[PDB]
Chains A and B, each alone.
Chain A
Amino acid sequence: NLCPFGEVFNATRFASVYAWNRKRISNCVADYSVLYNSASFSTFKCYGVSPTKLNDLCFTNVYADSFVIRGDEVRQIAPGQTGKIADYNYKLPDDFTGCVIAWNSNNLDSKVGGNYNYLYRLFRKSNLKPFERDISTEIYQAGSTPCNGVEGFNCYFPLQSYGFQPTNGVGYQPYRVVVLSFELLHAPATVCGP
């Protein structure tokens, strides 16, 4: 059984970063080299392991999280980061073992007149936990007074739409991002290389 990475990487539709999607990978053989050597990604960072040794390793599980952000935010998808993306949308553990893979997706996510379909969370009472997912859509209470389900003074909608315009600079562009997380449990390893 070859690991089904095309289903995640070639998925026709990607989630907004606040409702990021997750698939689990187990009991298969992954060929990382064909992803790494592919020339289809502008970022392929790894944490905890060298990308050149991935085909020699075995893991208990793999998790493929995927979403869309802007390019100039791919640096926030990494342990120890801060800001709205890492704090209210997608947090990585300090001891993250995995790899982050990102690419400009104007191919599929460009829209004449603008694409405002991708959203990110703006406010939160506390920071996310590593791999927590907040998809709620309740009004955010930024004051001592309850909001009672409506906007008002100190009461704001918590999500913001990216203004992906064809005219934008190279950093304010839609980037599809896939995070492979390698599970290092004290268990049999079911996902190995060739």
Chain B
Amino acid sequence: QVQLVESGGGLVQAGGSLRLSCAASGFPVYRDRMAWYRQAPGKEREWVAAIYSAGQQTRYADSVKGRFTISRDNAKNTVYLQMNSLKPEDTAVYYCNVKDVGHHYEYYDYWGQGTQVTVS
């Protein structure tokens, strides 16, 4: 059974930094794609960053392209999102995400609970 748990958000004054963690279980962290998404209050869930096993290894949205770095750790089966130079606009709940295919060629999108990041 597939499981994703986010951790590491919190309260930060502008210019600060955080390291979000996505602990995965039920599947190896080395795989096609693991993504990080954002949902702010009132807005819609926003794709932030992703890591891949084929092609360009990491991709980032334009708004975070110089400040965030995504990485994978196979030992702990975790995916990290280092966020530097934080801004109030980065304030949101952060989720990690994988898409699996099943016995009937159906696709299902897994998510975690999320972690809150608040910047001032």
* A touching B, CB within 8 angstroms: yes
Q: Is the CB of A137 within 8 A of B47?
A: no
Say which one of A35-43, A44-52, A148-156 lies at the interface with B: A148-156
B-chain residues with CB within 8 Å of residue A136 when the two chains form the complex: 55
- Complex Cα gap A86–B30 (Å): 26
Residues of A within 8 A of B67 (CB): none
Q: Which residue of A lies closest to B31 (CB)?
A: A116
Q: Which chain B residues border A157 with CB–CB below 8 Å?
A: 32-33, 50, 52
Contact between chains at A161 and B103 (CB < 8 Å): no
A167 to chain B, nearest CB (A): 10
Which B residues are CB-close (under 8 A) to A171? Answer: 103
Which chain B residue shows the least CB distance to A84? B105
User: CB < 8 Å: which of B26, B27, B59 contacts A151?
Assistant: B59
Tell whether A166 is near chain B: CB-to-CB under 8 Å.
Answer: no
Question: Judging by beta carbons under 8 Å apart, are B32 and A160 in contact?
Answer: yes
* Total A-B Cβ pairs within 8 A: 65
- Decide yes or no: A114 and B32 within 8 Å by CB, A157-B52, A159-B54, A171-B103 being known contacts: no
The interface bits of chain A over 79-118 (1 if a CB of B lies within 8 angstroms of the residue's CB, else 0) are: 0000010000000000000000000000000010111110
Residues 86-112 of B, flagged 1 when their CB comes within 8 A of A and 0 if not, give 000000000000011111010100000
- Is B53 an interface residue when CB atoms closer than 8 A count as contact? yes
- Residues on B with C-beta less than 8 A from A160 are 32, 99, 101, 107
Question: Residues 43-58 of chain B: 1 if any A CB is under 8 Å from the residue's CB, otherwise 0?
Answer: 0000100101111100
A157 to B31, CA, bound (A): 13
| Chain B residues, CB < 8 A from A162 | 101
Given contacts A116-B30, A157-B52, 16 further A-B contacts (CB under 8 A): A84-B105, A114-B27, A116-B32, A116-B53, A117-B31, A119-B32, A137-B55, A138-B55, A150-B47, A150-B62, A159-B54, A160-B99, A161-B101, A163-B27, A163-B102, A169-B103
